Design a protein around this ligand. Structure first.
Ligand code: ADP
Lengths: 250, 201, 48, 50, 195, 50, 195, 50
């Protein structure tokens, strides 16, 4: 049976271990491992599976469609804010349809651990609030990208307590094999350049989950696989110049 | 094609420059554009471009060129001749030229839209006087050497209207910090794990 | 593969480990187990 | 007027179609890939377009 | 007993002072309060050597330096005004904006406020005068630097998502044809300086 | 949806469901504050009413 | 139609508004003119909901808000007045200056001799809590930047030829220094603990 | 197919094969059942699909 995955290990990078802290309906630290031959995630509906799926998604895509699997067709009932604040919402279990476990000043982090043949490479983020204000700007941000075994959320939290973002940036400057970025755009470029793929693939992956909602092959090559090259704006534009020139004529 | 774009941008610039001049009839404006259109059927660049444009209406060669290029790139030794990106780009020559030509048409467009800007709003009423004064000012401004910052910063006799008055320096406006608390949200790295004795049949 | 409880039988045939996710009020926990450990713990549940 | 507007209305309806002759080239790659895997014990898939 | 002015009058005058202009289309209540006691506004600005400008055709109210027994000399030396003085490039862009404003006015009338142009529309209009910096981003920086200040004077709105701006009606008076002729004479003096 | 509301009787009004106490006949809750997971809990009330 | 406001009253009122606070020892003529026309000045300022506070003992005049008494904005806010909230170090230096000004007004009179202190005297007080920044040049730069910022706040003067500043009387006119007292108690407690 | 057959009797215009698209659209018709069509046959003149 091992031969079906004999390609693995050798060729591609792999996803093995997911560190979580104060994400979704989880508190403190939590860990999972993924065996080099695949794995299933199990538990009663309402436990965490969609939460974990989404929790990995942030690192790879710029537009997380949270909770797509049960909702493909309409907008997600959830967002980055709700998860980070630990809002149970309708899943309150009777707690005023809201329940909020981290409303005040709080810190949240995530870190996935890709690798190949022992070469660790870690994609991690940190999101935190200073007050009950829940503006988009209130959430201060910082990504991570490292291939040094000495870096982990389990470590980065200690420094974040030891000092502000200046201290983290100082660690980045002093240490080696570590980079940080306040903008996700440059970080996503830092991904694409490493993995030698455009900006398309790492999106389609985020619509793999929506397979439940297929009508026919006729869609898979009209909404997911093919990119967009439409020209409604251009086609509209030419009609103008024609009218202006007719105006000169008249 | 970029060179042709340069010519059309320059023509647009000159046409606007001249429009700011007070001396042209409607005929002058509407005729200079046709003179430009016939101006760019002379140079090697214009010859090239207008020759190409027809070669979409009668698509004799724009299959032959791609086809033969496909033939050449099918030869093995070509791999050594050109790096991979060169070959990929060359294989789609026709498309990239078609999509590049889109830039020039717009680069001519601007002038194709300017003249309509003069036919309609014939100067009249107080607008005539205001526009003529503005045109005089603009024309006179040309004489200056505008490169010097200090000159561009030189203060003008325009009247101070719509004056913004605010920011009174009152003592009451001053307040000090109003908190001194401090505490840490300690790190709870307790290694949690699931408890398999808790879920049912 | 994610999947609800149903047809664990199929996934036992094409995997080497599984992750359980427990729900309890507003605290949710999870563990990574090989199939053999899960089988032993089921046997103990049978002993429970 | 005729020359300019006609060049425009042609530089569009070349561009629109010309894409199709790129979509019909990507599908070769998938038909290339799907030839390496047996869908049924001696069958393989392939993609075509009307 | 006390000379306390009516609270609504104080509100309207304080707002007008805070922003230096007041449009009925935006804040009709304060505008009508001002035009209900315009002599009160005058007699309050008169202590400050300031005066109320009024243009009801565009539903606009703005404050302007008054003439003291000395006509404020160079009125820009008035103690209260917080801003600097206008300069050449600002006047150039003001003239171009007023040109577009008068065109739009002939097109749709004077009282409305829907006029607009885009960043790329402005960029050639000034690039003709200012030379080419060498990159599009640099000329955009130039234009935005000018626009920030001109907004600081209330002439224009902030750059929108479409990279356009809305002309404020007050420009009708900064670009007064009498003031334009005076500035033309001043420009002739600048020519004499160049001479 | 605006035209729908203007013309469709169905879009002129909205609907909701209350949980009723069989003993006192009182309402305890009017919202499914126990739903979540992969959305597999909403099916209860919907299927019951259907 | 009717008379204008007297020139000197207008000029003095505008001067005070520009400066916020002024001294008889600085401009005695305007000081006397305003104090001879307080009704006129307040009538000029009450439409703005502003007014003036004075201290003849220390010879200082200054502005003051005159809104309607105690609205819900007890932490008041006024249109024409943008308020400020100083930082840790700014208010720290303010507390230092307050304590030494209190001492001076006892050992040198309530403004009879303008409150003074040397740079080499303020610097040790800051060093009590902040410690040595790294060099004497750094100490002087820190204290001089802070003193300049407070001078922009109208609280202190620049050091004299002997590096001695003069404390403006306005320091005695702060609203609620109880916060300063609590802050200074906290600072002394912290340094006592952190030594 | 069995449920489709029964459904032809109870309904005015039953939507055959509905559960294959969640509720969106029907694919088959009535006649093909009578003709016993074994799906869409190959285009090479077919006749093996009926
Ligand atoms: N905004 C929300 N609304 C409802 N439930 C939420 C929300 N955010 C988080 N949750 C909770 O997080 C979990 C999401 O369900 P999950 O267990 O991830 O789904 P499944 O395992 O069924 O794929 C549930 O416990 C759900 O109640």
């Amino acid at each position: 049976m091992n031969q079906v995955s004999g390609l693995a290990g050798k060729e591609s990078f792999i996803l093995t271990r997911i560190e979580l802290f104060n994400w979704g309906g989880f508190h403190g630290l939590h860990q999972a491992a993924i065996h080099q031959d695949g794995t299933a995630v199990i538990g009663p509906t309402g436990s965490g599976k969609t939460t974990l799926v989404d929790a990995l998604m942030t690192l790879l895509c710029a537009n997380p469609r949270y909770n797509l699997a049960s909702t493909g067709g309409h907008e997600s009932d959830r967002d980055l804010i709700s998860y980070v604040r630990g809002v149970s919402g309708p899943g309150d279990g009777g707690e005023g349809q809201s329940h909020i476990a981290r409303p005040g000043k709080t810190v949240t982090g995530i870190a996935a651990t890709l690798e190949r043949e022992g070469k660790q490479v870690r994609l991690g983020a940190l999101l935190w609030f200073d007050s009950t204000s829940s503006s988009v700007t209130d959430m201060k941000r910082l990504w991570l990208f490292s291939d040094n075994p000495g870096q982990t959320l389990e470590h980065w939290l200690n420094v974040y307590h030891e000092g502000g973002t200046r201290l983290l940036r100082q660690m980045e400057k002093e240490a080696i094999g570590l980079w940080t970025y306040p903008n996700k755009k440059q970080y996503l470029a830092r991904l694409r350049d490493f993995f030698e793929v455009g900006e398309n693939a790492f999106t389609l992956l985020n619509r793999a989950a929506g397979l439940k909602q297929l009508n026919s092959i006729d869609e898979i090559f009209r909404e997911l696989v093919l990119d967009d090259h439409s020209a409604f704006d251009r086609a509209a534009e030419v009609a103008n110049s024609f009218d202006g020139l007719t105006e000169i004529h008249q | 094609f970029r060179r042709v774009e340069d010519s059309w941008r320059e023509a647009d610039r000159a046409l606007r420059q001249s429009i700011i001049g007070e001396q042209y009839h409607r005929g002058d404006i509407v005729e200079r554009l046709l003179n430009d259109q016939d101006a760019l059927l002379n140079t090697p660049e214009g010859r090239v471009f207008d020759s190409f444009q027809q070669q979409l209406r009668q698509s004799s060669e724009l299959k032959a060129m791609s086809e033969r290029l496909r033939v050449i790139l099918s030869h093995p030794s070509a791999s050594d001749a050109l790096n991979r990106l060169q070959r990929h780009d060359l294989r789609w020559l026709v498309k990239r030229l078609v999509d590049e030509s889109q830039t020039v048409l717009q680069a001519r467009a601007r002038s194709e839209r300017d003249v309509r800007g003069f036919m309609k709003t014939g100067l009249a009423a107080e607008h005539h006087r205001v526009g003529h004064l503005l045109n005089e000012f603009l024309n006179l401004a040309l004489k200056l050497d505008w490169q010097r910052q200090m000159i561009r910063k030189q203060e003008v006799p325009l009247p101070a209207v719509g004056v913004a008055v605010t920011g009174i320096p009152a003592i009451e406006r001053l307040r000090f910090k109003e908190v001194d608390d401090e505490a840490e949200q300690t790190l709870d790295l307790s290694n949690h794990a699931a408890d398999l004795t808790q879920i049912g049949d | 593969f994610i999947t609800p409880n149903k047809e664990m039988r199929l996934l036992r045939d094409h995997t080497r480990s599984a992750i359980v996710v427990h729900r309890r009020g507003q605290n949710s926990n999870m563990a990574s187990l090989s199939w053999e450990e899960l089988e032993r713990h089921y046997q103990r549940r049978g002993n429970a | 007027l005729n020359r300019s507007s006609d060049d425009g209305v042609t530089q569009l309806l070349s561009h629109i179609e010309h894409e199709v002759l790129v979509i019909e080239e990507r599908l070769n790659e998938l038909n290339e890939t799907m030839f390496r895997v047996d869908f049924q014990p001696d069958r393989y898939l392939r993609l075509d377009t009307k | 007993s006390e000379t306390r002015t009516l609270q609504k009058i104080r509100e309207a005058t304080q707002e007008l002072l805070k922003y230096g202009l007041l449009e009925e289309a935006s804040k009709p209540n304060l505008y009508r309060i001002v035009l209900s006691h315009p002599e009160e506004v005058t007699r309050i600005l008169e202590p400050l050597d300031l005066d109320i400008g009024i243009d009801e055709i565009r539903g606009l109210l703005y404050v302007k330096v008054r003439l003291d027994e000395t006509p404020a000399q160079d009125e820009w030396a008035h103690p209260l005004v917080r801003r600097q003085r206008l300069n050449l490039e600002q006047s150039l862009l003001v003239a171009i904006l007023r040109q577009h404003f008068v065109a739009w006015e002939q097109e749709s009338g004077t009282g409305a406020s829907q006029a607009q142009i885009a960043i790329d529309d402005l960029l050639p209009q000034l690039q003709i005068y200012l030379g080419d910096p060498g990159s599009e981003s640099k000329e955009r920086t130039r234009l935005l630097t000018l626009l920030d200040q001109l907004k600081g004077h209330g002439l224009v709105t902030s750059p929108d998502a479409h990279e356009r701006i809305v002309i404020r009606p007050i420009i009708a008076h900064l670009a007064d044809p009498i003031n334009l002729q005076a500035l033309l004479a001043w420009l002739r003096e600048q020519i004499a300086q160049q001479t | 949806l605006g035209a729908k509301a203007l013309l469709d009787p169905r879009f002129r009004l909205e609907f909701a469901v209350s949980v009723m106490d069989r003993q006192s006949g009182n309402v305890i809750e009017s919202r499914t504050g126990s739903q979540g997971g992969s959305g597999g809990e909403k099916e209860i009330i919907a299927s019951y009413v259907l």
